[PDB]
Amino acid sequence: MRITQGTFSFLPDLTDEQIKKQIDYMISKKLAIGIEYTNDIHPRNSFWEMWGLPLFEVTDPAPVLFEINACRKAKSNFYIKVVGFSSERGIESTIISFIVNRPKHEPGFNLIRQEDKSRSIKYSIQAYETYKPEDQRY
Amino acid sequence: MRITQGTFSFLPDLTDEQIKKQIDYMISKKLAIGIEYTNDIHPRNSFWEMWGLPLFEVTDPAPVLFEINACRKAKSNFYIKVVGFSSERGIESTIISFIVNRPKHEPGFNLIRQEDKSRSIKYSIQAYETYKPEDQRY
Amino acid sequence: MRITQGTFSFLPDLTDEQIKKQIDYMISKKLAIGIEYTNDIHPRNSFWEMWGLPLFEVTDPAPVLFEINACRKAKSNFYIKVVGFSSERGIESTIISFIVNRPKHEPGFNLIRQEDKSRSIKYSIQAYETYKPEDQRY
Amino acid sequence: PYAKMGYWNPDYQVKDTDVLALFRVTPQPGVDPIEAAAAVAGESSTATWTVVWTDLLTAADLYRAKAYKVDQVPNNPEQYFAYIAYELDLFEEGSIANLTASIIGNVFGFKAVKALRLEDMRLPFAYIKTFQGPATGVILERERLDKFGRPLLGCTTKPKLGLSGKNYGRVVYEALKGGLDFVKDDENINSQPFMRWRERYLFVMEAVNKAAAATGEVKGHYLNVTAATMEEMYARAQLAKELGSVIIMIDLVIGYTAIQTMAKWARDNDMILHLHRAGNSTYSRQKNHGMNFRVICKWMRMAGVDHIHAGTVVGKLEGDPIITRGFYKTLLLPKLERNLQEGLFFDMDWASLRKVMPVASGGIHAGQMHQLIHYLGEDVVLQFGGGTIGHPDGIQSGATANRVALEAMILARNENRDFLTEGPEILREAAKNCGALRTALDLWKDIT
Amino acid sequence: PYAKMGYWNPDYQVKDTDVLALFRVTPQPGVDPIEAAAAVAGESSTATWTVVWTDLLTAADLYRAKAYKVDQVPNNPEQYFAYIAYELDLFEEGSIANLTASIIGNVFGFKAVKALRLEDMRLPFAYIKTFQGPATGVILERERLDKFGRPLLGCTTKPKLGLSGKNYGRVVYEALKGGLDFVKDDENINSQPFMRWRERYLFVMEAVNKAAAATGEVKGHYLNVTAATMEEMYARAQLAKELGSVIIMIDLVIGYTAIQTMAKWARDNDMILHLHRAGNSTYSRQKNHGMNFRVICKWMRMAGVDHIHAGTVVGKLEGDPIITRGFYKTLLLPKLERNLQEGLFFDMDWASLRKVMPVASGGIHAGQMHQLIHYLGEDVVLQFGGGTIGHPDGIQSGATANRVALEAMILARNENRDFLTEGPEILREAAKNCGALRTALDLWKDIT
Amino acid sequence: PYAKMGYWNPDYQVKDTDVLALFRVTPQPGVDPIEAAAAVAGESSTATWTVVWTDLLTAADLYRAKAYKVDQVPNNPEQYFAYIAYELDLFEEGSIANLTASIIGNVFGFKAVKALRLEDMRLPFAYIKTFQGPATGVILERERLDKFGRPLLGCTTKPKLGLSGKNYGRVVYEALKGGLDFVKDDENINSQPFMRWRERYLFVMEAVNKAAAATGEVKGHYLNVTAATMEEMYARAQLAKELGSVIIMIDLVIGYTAIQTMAKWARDNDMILHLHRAGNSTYSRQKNHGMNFRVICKWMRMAGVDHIHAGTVVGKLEGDPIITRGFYKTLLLPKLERNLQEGLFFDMDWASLRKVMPVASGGIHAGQMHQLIHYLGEDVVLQFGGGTIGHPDGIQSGATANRVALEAMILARNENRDFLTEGPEILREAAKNCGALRTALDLWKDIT
């Protein structure tokens, strides 16, 4: 399956040309830019791993693309996303987050149903790769 | 003081001519007519004493006025009222009730304040004449 | 006993000269001036009877003293007080209230103790004169 | 394409269980009346804009409203009366919010109609029977008060706002002792920096019990329990009950779920519930758009309020006498008969739900008593205002003048005098014995 | 005699703490504009019709509303804009019912005005600060969903009514798994003989968790908790929380006290609260009478709903684009600047209250994506209808087509393409890689 | 390096919403005034000692306090007045603990300042509006007691500790019946081996009701509800309410969260809440370090106590008359005007929060009545001590002497006599008619 977290995940995976134009937009919006990666693709895994520190005051997409590519080489079989943080008062949060690398095959999620009172169920979702240690996924 | 229970108590006490015209109205409304009397004038004294049974199917005010006058003589120092009961479905209740006799002097009511939690008070009202036995009031 | 509601009740009863100087003060404070009277001296009897309407925009103590004296004659065996209402924002209330007439003898108050749970008691206080009808007190 | 989609059916046979709505419809310049009607049915029932196959997993026809009759309105060629029927099963038992959502949901914002006004509804007996109806109702209310055969009298505290809790209580005491049956909180007084709610309630109950003791009558003051959240309303309601108040009031703007919540509360707590209709004119006033007030009267009798402001025929709201009569009928009768002039478009049986007491206020005075009685009848609360509080002789005098006029008028009516014709004279004879009333007549004769 | 009674004051100096209202006023044929304005101020503040001496026991001027400016409206000589100021002390902190009562109380039924419409209000900072504002708000909502930089997508279940709890859940599952972020209950589905509420909730949560597991996203369904009484609403809300729903919905017809009650509940229970505006058009539609919808947007942001239907510029409600923009601003900005074309008559600071997510629905399709993005911006929930469920290839395909179009449009916008001009082509390029979307474009090109 | 890090800004423009603090600053021998000021701003806001990149994920400037003006203090070259501004958004609405933490947190232990004293604060209107303010307040308190136009009189039971519940009640009864409006528990009497709390309350209420019955006045005794935990305080509070006490008291050492908890309780339970300021002098006494008492008066009026000990000008605390006046102003006025001699450094509007009753105690006697009235004014509770209980003629006589002096002084003031100059004579004339007062004057003439 195809995991559809991310702003453009219903599109084909972005080319580097496409990514570069998204960095331009981020820059024009004055965002801090973070590159983050993970191999527990659970939708409530809020804290992916950080690839270095966010880049602030970026003025050219080049350094950003370089780190993205450095991350892809070191972590080719992890999901990797780019995140743009706005520091505008009242927002002070993420305003864009999209996937720039996927592992080659995504097996998806186990759905667990624990039967509770009457007819209610307590659900968990667990990504299949996380039944394996980190250094063995994907 | 003047007790103002009753439909016409803010008017002067009714003459017998006036009462007779109220019986006419009751009759035209097809009411049962009851004459009731009391010497505990508390506003929550819901059950005054009955002077005989209500009169049904009355067609002339005469018999009613006669009982009213019979009640006044026997109970001259009691309040006496005339009550018209409607049996119309959905009403089935009193639709008029007015005073036709008052005692000569009404001393009124004691107000009792029992102090309860914080600033709240539990009130009673007690007619002064009821500090006396029935056969000694008014 | 001497009832000590009122701003100056621990002083001797005021002379008319004294009262007049209190009206001067009220006037200088721009108060509405009310004359109120009662023969249920309970301390929680918040609503004494009104002797006419409060006097507004008074500029001379004379009209006020005249009403005070008119009230004393008509109600000589009632307590009578003078009350000054401030309309100043954030106050909007009484700022002075003193006695200008007392009945000739005050018998005082009955204390009633209703025994409630454990050792608690529910108290009432009842002025002795209110065991009598209004038109017979004092 | 609504008329072809099943939403128009001049043949449809209305059932006794159907909810029926009467809409006053103003189609867009080009669009056909039947198409307008069908659009309103469709848009408020199963209004999907492509074909959906999921419809076929259900008994689809049942959930479609049906426009089944259109007539052009008597004097205005550009308006039509559209009759629509809804299956009883579409609605949640006992729920005003569901009925409202379902009926007035989308269709007022729809484009193929210029304007749209819900005018009447036929609530079927079986639906009406799932509602509590008035917590108390006229009949028990009068048995509780021991007040029969005459309107009841009230007024709102003046100034509406600003008096301290103690100065507030003063006005209550004077008005009740002077002869009014009730005094009330303004719809705007809840709990504010100049006066919090608890001291108001506490002073008020001393006023109310003092006046009972002074007159020998059951008296009351509508304590306004209106608050931002339900728990806060319950706290206020609870204090009024604890202190023994006979009556509380709520503003219509708390909305329908809070009103049904309180109506249950009042039933279970032996409390009269007065509904203040504040805000209602924003949708009930214009003749071409919104909802007619009679439909509000139906919903509020179902929900279970005991009093509701229903109109005065004379005064600051000289509205149509025949339309107002229609409102009072809805509120008070066991059964409604269709009467086009009154604006009652359907017969309707009230399924023995209790009656609601109508309330007339808005620039009325004792000098109109004969029209008031003539138009509004006997089961009504006549609410005075500056009529009472600004009597030159004082609040007690203001109250007495009103009470004397009222009683003299009812006495005259029951004598079978032609009170409407003879009313000014009947007032004059009463004023002969009542100074307070003479002063009031003199003072408000030229009232324009 | 209102203009002479103190209710007109062109000199009055407005304070930062004053509540200010802007009314669109249509005087009676004879009556003067200033007299009309003063009448509206007077009638909604201290509006007594004789003199009362009890006023003098208070600081009377404070409790008087003041009409302080009148202008004739740009194109209609018979209408005036009246500006009125109310002292902050007149109102209960945190209470919409009190604000509403106080402002829109009597004045809509008053005779010396033909028609009257509340158009805007300036809520002062110090009053706004006493309200909770949105339980969740746009920013936290997106952090909860982990969905950033794009509108969110939803649709209402079709048929609105009739499916069994199990057949109902089927549609939810298909829609969420196909790409929609949300599915919702219709405003009319509460609990009815064809389907009671509990089985709906229970099937729905299985659908929702199944779709999370299928897509790797947080998904949700607005469970409608609308019910007749507050205790019944709490029971429904509690089940949604117990089953772990991310979101519930309420209908505006439950009324304001129940909405603030629920808004507190949602804040304390980590629940997104969607407000469905069902019924709003009865008073917000006509341009001459009632209340403008922007004033509702203000009150509902204060009360603390998280989403509210705010208008689509294109489709079954092609309303004014510049007026709609005004609505979205009210909902979303930290500060409002007066702009007469948008219908924002006052500057207004929102005192750091959270943002509400606007929702666009009503005959929209993927073929309009470029106008939708252009008009409505990025923080909006685009709600499809027959747009999704009646795709010839199935519900999942309907959903996917919408999601692909949305993302392709945002991608284009961020590339700085002229997406409004180039939009149909941008759609075509996306459809090259997406059959479901090609089918949707072909199918809804001539949509009239 | 604070002055260069953004924490010093002599240009900063203060907003109406900003919280402003005035600190009396004593820099370390070498350090510059501006650097001292900036350090205090920095150290209490965003005070990190290296660079942090996480700042840039926020609107960092908003969360920085700003030192915006420094002046050297009038007579002491080594001290500066530093003005600092904090954004309203930094604070939790209605929370004294948050305000306190935020303002006085770190900076008193900081090294680059020798000494530091918070002198005044400007609480902005919009923040003040989120607090309840006094449960009761002066105005309602006097309406509850029906006592107007004069100070109220009280005293603390002597011996403070040791009397049995029955012997304790004796003193209460004698004092109230003799003329005092109140008697009180000492701040040290809670529940101890020599006397547990319940029997004290039960004997006391019999005393209090006996004295009401003897005098015809509402009387009260501050029952001290101070206890180790909140549940224990609630138990005590609940008994006082159950027995019908008009008043309870709390010690300031229970701390701010418990005080706001009780203040809410007293508002909801119609109870006067007296705050005893025990312990306050440990930080409010020295002129160079700590917090000035006027800032405590502000916080406690916000939190919502009804009485607070505020100073006597004469007696065992002959403190500055002009500074004390400043305290009474804070407590009692609707608005504060900056007046450097009083120690009020900012204008401040109280946003219609209720007034707190100041309490004067500490070695006062009837022989000072004319200075007391002159300095402290009319809204104050004058608390006597050995002044009352140790009258040679008995407790009742002690009380009467105080009450006679008080009333005679107010009567004189209202006659416009020069009571300050003529006071000893005014006392002498009153004592002519009052033996108890003659004995008191003779006894306490040479009091040194």
Curated annotation (Swiss-Prot), chains A, B, C:
Subunit structure: Heterohexadecamer of 8 large and 8 small subunits.
Source organism (scientific name): Galdieria sulphuraria (Red alga)
Biological process terms in GO annotation: reductive pentose-phosphate cycle
GO molecular function annotations of the record: ribulose-bisphosphate carboxylase activity
HAMAP family reported for this sequence: RuBisCO_S_bact (MF_00859)
PANTHER family: RIBULOSE BISPHOSPHATE CARBOXYLASE SMALL CHAIN 1, CHLOROPLASTIC (PTHR31262), RIBULOSE BISPHOSPHATE CARBOXYLASE SMALL SUBUNIT (PTHR31262:SF23)
Other noteworthy facts: In this alga, in contrast to plants, the small subunit is encoded in the chloroplast.
Gene this protein is translated from: rbcS
Entry keyword annotation includes Plastid: yes
One Pfam family of this chain: RuBisCO_small
Coiled-coil positions: none
Role, per record: RuBisCO catalyzes two reactions: the carboxylation of D-ribulose 1,5-bisphosphate, the primary event in carbon dioxide fixation, as well as the oxidative fragmentation of the pentose substrate in the photorespiration process. Both reactions occur simultaneously and in competition at the same active site. Although the small subunit is not catalytic it is essential for maximal activity. Carbon dioxide and oxygen bind in the same pocket of the enzyme in a similar manner.
Family recorded in the similarity comment: Belongs to the RuBisCO small chain family.
Organism placement in taxonomy: Eukaryota, Rhodophyta, Bangiophyceae, Galdieriales, Galdieriaceae
Domain of life: Eukaryota
GO cellular component labels: chloroplast
Compartment(s): Plastid, Chloroplast
Protein name: Ribulose bisphosphate carboxylase small subunit
Keywords assigned: Calvin cycle, Carbon dioxide fixation, Chloroplast, Photorespiration, Photosynthesis, Plastid
From Swiss-Prot, chains D, E, F:
Active site feature: 158, 276
Subcellular location: Plastid, Chloroplast
Gene3D superfamilies given in the database record: Ribulose bisphosphate carboxylase, large subunit, C-terminal domain, RuBisCO large subunit, N-terminal domain
Residue(s) carrying S-nitrosocysteine: 155, 434
GO cellular component, one term: chloroplast
EC numbers for this chain: 4.1.1.39
Cofactors (names): Mg(2+)
Catalysed transformations (reactions): 2 (2R)-3-phosphoglycerate + 2 H(+) = D-ribulose 1,5-bisphosphate + CO2 + H2O; D-ribulose 1,5-bisphosphate + O2 = 2-phosphoglycolate + (2R)-3-phosphoglycerate + 2 H(+)
Residues noted as binding substrate in the record, renumbered to the chain: 106, 156, 160, 277, 309, 361
PTM-bearing positions, type N6-carboxylysine: 184
Cofactor remark from the record: Binds 1 Mg(2+) ion per subunit.
Keywords of this entry: Calvin cycle, Carbon dioxide fixation, Chloroplast, Lyase, Magnesium, Metal-binding, Monooxygenase, Oxidoreductase, Photorespiration, Photosynthesis, Plastid, S-nitrosylation
Annotated residues for binding of Mg(2+): 184, 186-187
Residues the UniProt record annotates as site (Transition state stabilizer): 316
Function: RuBisCO catalyzes two reactions: the carboxylation of D-ribulose 1,5-bisphosphate, the primary event in carbon dioxide fixation, as well as the oxidative fragmentation of the pentose substrate in the photorespiration process. Both reactions occur simultaneously and in competition at the same active site. Carbon dioxide and oxygen bind in the same pocket of the enzyme in a similar manner.
Record-linked PANTHER family: RIBULOSE BISPHOSPHATE CARBOXYLASE (PTHR42704), RIBULOSE BISPHOSPHATE CARBOXYLASE LARGE CHAIN (PTHR42704:SF17)
Other comment: The basic functional RuBisCO is composed of a large chain homodimer in a 'head-to-tail' conformation. In form I RuBisCO this homodimer is arranged in a barrel-like tetramer with the small subunits forming a tetrameric 'cap' on each end of the 'barrel'.
NCBIfam families the UniProt entry points to: PRK04208.1
Description of how the protein assembles with itself and partners: Heterohexadecamer of 8 large chains and 8 small chains.
Family note: Belongs to the RuBisCO large chain family. Type I subfamily.
Record protein name field: Ribulose bisphosphate carboxylase large chain
Organism classification: Eukaryota, Rhodophyta, Bangiophyceae, Galdieriales, Galdieriaceae
Gene it is expressed from: rbcL
